[PDB]
Every structure is written in structure tokens, then in C-alpha cells.
Ligand binder design. Structure first.
Ligand SMILES: *C(=O)CCCCCCCCCCCCC
Lengths: 100, 4, 275
């Protein structure tokens, strides 16, 4: 069957400001089939109390999901999203860029 | 309803 | 026009039990309900404040419909595997989307109901809400079954009545968020990438509903082939975000314009990098 790989975006809800509480988002979209695993990472380690949306899909039948957590941007901590899907031989890591 |  | 739309997905897992069923419902781009047959407690659950007040009868009623549809989808997946002569070993997906658009008389403007198998169009209710379009000879079997079962008349009755009546109720109870467009808040950023090129990134933030157009022009000529356009994404607070970027010759930035279209804007917006 169809196997479309997720488009993975890692981003903050509000413009990032160091020391101001925000939300860290990992959005996966455009994928098929729907089984997928998503972790948010801080300094390489899994953030645990991460929430997520419910499985939905777009006009072209591809799926999308939002994973998110409260976080505080800092100068030196590294935030990322890790995704596994049948289209990936190993989990894909996307590091947060504050202007993407 | 009906199945496909 | 305003719309109510329901989405469902069933996924089989041969050898690991029966298929999983996940359903969600939306008014416009705002989710209000979810159901997951694999959830810790498989019940219809609220996902918007303007549906939290509905009584236990509403939630019992909706939960029973979801459980029945999950059971029906299991049969459909079994039938589809037969139609296409597929092995018992493979996992497959059945998706359904249906909904109603609200017309200016408070009644149905248009209805839609469509199904996909393994991510490809399968059968759809036509605009007349009376006839079906089948994608292939397998879906023509379904078409014949549903004509004999008078299925379209059932779907039409829901779309014309219950769907529009509840869409109107939700629009009133959640009016201070559902009947409010939020325009995009925009800005353009600039990132040199070499000694003579730079990225221009056009941002749209905080907008609702989700539909938006973001395009870059050079000397008024659209540059879509050379534009990196991310998928429209949820901010998590009910609003959406998007950006579009082009790599441009440094010193030509003034010749590039970002164009934004959204229902919350009185006219299309034209932007430039200003620093
Ligand atoms: C067949 O006549 C049994 C009726 C049960 C189906 C209830 C309506 C379908 C459920 C819709 C919600 C799930 C799809 C989003």
C-alpha cells in the first residue's frame, strides 16, 4: 500500500524569547499509513508529559498529528523531535530552529 | 449503516 | 460558509487483534470531539469548551454511534480485502469523511461523503446526494449494494437535517470563537547564505481559519517553483501558522514581494523585507 513519509516541523507556539514560558510543537503531516511514534527531546532525552492531538487527515487523505509540551527557551538547551514511521529505517531527529 |  | 465535518480511520493489524478505529469531528477548523477504540476508555470525548456542557445523553448517544461504526468498518475492511484479492497478512486502511456546509437560509448548502481505501479514493456521494461515484470495479460493487440498501437517502436525511441543525447549535454556543476570523500577523526575516545570496522568509502567524495563500513575487512574477512552502501548521491555541521562503540575490531584496490572502484580510497584503 501507499507509504508517504511525514513532513516534520519543530517550532514554538509564540516567538521564542529566552526565559519566557512557551509551547514546543512537533507537527507531523502528509504521512500514510497512520502508525507513527513521536517524541519531544530536551538535550537528547525524552520529555515525558507530552500531549498530542487526535488522528485526523487532509483532503488528500494524508494524516497529521501535533505533539506539544510547555517549555522555556534558553540559550544552551537543545530541543528536538524524534519520529518513527514505516518509511524510516531509523528514527528521524529534527532539531528546533527558532526561525522555522 | 451498510458495510462497503 | 461554515461546515461541520467528521473524519474516521480504521486500520487493520492481522494477527494482532481487530482493527483500530479513530474518529474526530470539526466545526470549520476547530475540533470538538474525538473517539479512539484503543483509548484507555473508549468514549466520545469533548475537545472544545462549547460542547463540554452537553449532557451525558449526548455523549452516550455519540459513543454508541462510534462503536457501531467501528464494527461496520471491520466488516468493510474484510469485504475490501476480498474485492481486491489481497492477502490476509497485510494491514489496510479505511478512511471516511463527511460533512455539511451551512447555507444562507440556515439549511444545507451542500453535503459530501467520501471514502478511501489504502489512501486512494473509493466511493463518493455525488452532489445530488442521491447517486454515488465509484472509483473502480470494486467500488461499483459497493455502489450496487448501497443503491439496493437505499443508503444515499439515509445519508441525505442526516446531512439535510441533523448535520445542519447541530452545526447551527454549535455555531451559536461557540460563537465568540467560531464566528471570528483572525487575520494573519506577518513579518519577513532575512538570512544571508553566501557572499551574494540570502533567504527571505515570509511569516503568517496567529490566523484562523487555516486556509491561507502565501506567495513570493520577483518583479511581480510569481516564484512558486523556487519557493519553499511549509505545510500550514497548528499553533496549539486554535490558530495556525505558515511560512514561505525564497533564496534571492543579495542586493535584489527590494524586488521581491510576499503576497498574503486570508479571509480575515480586507484585501490581499503585499509585504517587503524592510531592514
Ligand atoms: C447503520 O445504520 C448503523 C448506524 C450506526 C452508524 C452511526 C453513524 C455513523 C457514525 C458517524 C461517526 C463516525 C464517523 C466519523
Amino acid at each position: 500500500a501507499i507509504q508517504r513519509t511525514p513532513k516534520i516541523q519543530v517550532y514554538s507556539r509564540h516567538p521564542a524569547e529566552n526565559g519566557k514560558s512557551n509551547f514546543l510543537n512537533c507537527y507531523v503531516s502528509g504521512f500514510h499509513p497512520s502508525d507513527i511514534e513521536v517524541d519531544l527531546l530536551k538535550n537528547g532525552e525524552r520529555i515525558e508529559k507530552v500531549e498530542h492531538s487526535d488522528l485526523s487527515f487532509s483532503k488528500d487523505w494524508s494524516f497529521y498529528l501535533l505533539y506539544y509540551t510547555e517549555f522555556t527557551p534558553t540559550e544552551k538547551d537543545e530541543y528536538a523531535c524524534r519520529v518513527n514511521h514505516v518509511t524510516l529505517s531509523q528514527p528521524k531527529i529534527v532539531k528546533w530552529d527558532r526561525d522555522m | 449503516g451498510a458495510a462497503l | 460558509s461554515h461546515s461541520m465535518r467528521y473524519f474516521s480511520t480504521s486500520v487493520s493489524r492481522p494477527g494482532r487483534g481487530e482493527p483500530r478505529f479513530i474518529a474526530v469531528g470539526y466545526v470549520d477548523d476547530t475540533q470538538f470531539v474525538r473517539f479512539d477504540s484503543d483509548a484507555a476508555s473508549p468514549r466520545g470525548e469533548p475537545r472544545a469548551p462549547w460542547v463540554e456542557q452537553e449532557g451525558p445523553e449526548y455523549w452516550d448517544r455519540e459513543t454508541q454511534k462510534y462503536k457501531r461504526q467501528a464494527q461496520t468498518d471491520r466488516v468493510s475492511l474484510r469485504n475490501l480485502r476480498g474485492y481486491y484479492n489481497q492477502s490476509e497478512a497485510g494491514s489496510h486502511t479505511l478512511q471516511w469523511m463527511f460533512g455539511c456546509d451551512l447555507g444562507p437560509d440556515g439549511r444545507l448548502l451542500r453535503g459530501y461523503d467520501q471514502s478511501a481505501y489504502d489512501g486512494k479514493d473509493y466511493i463518493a456521494l455525488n452532489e445530488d446526494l442521491r447517486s454515488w461515484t465509484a472509483a473502480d470495479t470494486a467500488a461499483q460493487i459497493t455502489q450496487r449494494k448501497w443503491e439496493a440498501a437505499r443508503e444515499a437517502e439515509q445519508r441525505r436525511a442526516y446531512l439535510e437535517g441533523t448535520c445542519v441543525e447541530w452545526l447551527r447549535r454549535y455555531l451559536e454556543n461557540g460563537k465568540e470563537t467560531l464566528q471570528r476570523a483572525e487575520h494573519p500577523k506577518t513579518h519577513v526575516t532575512h538570512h544571508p547564505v553566501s557572499d551574494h545570496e540570502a533567504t527571505l522568509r515570509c511569516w503568517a502567524l496567529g490566523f484562523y481559519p487555516a486556509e491561507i495563500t502565501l506567495t513570493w513575487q520577483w518583479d511581480g512574477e510569481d516564484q512558486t517553483q523556487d519557493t519553499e512552502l511549509v505545510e500550514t501548521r497548528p499553533a496549539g491555541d486554535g490558530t495556525f501558522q505558515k511560512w514561505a521562503a525564497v533564496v534571492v540575490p543579495s542586493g535584489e531584496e527590494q524586488r521581491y514581494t510576499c503576497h498574503v490572502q486570508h479571509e480575515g484580510l480586507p484585501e490581499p497584503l503585499t509585504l517587503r523585507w524592510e531592514p
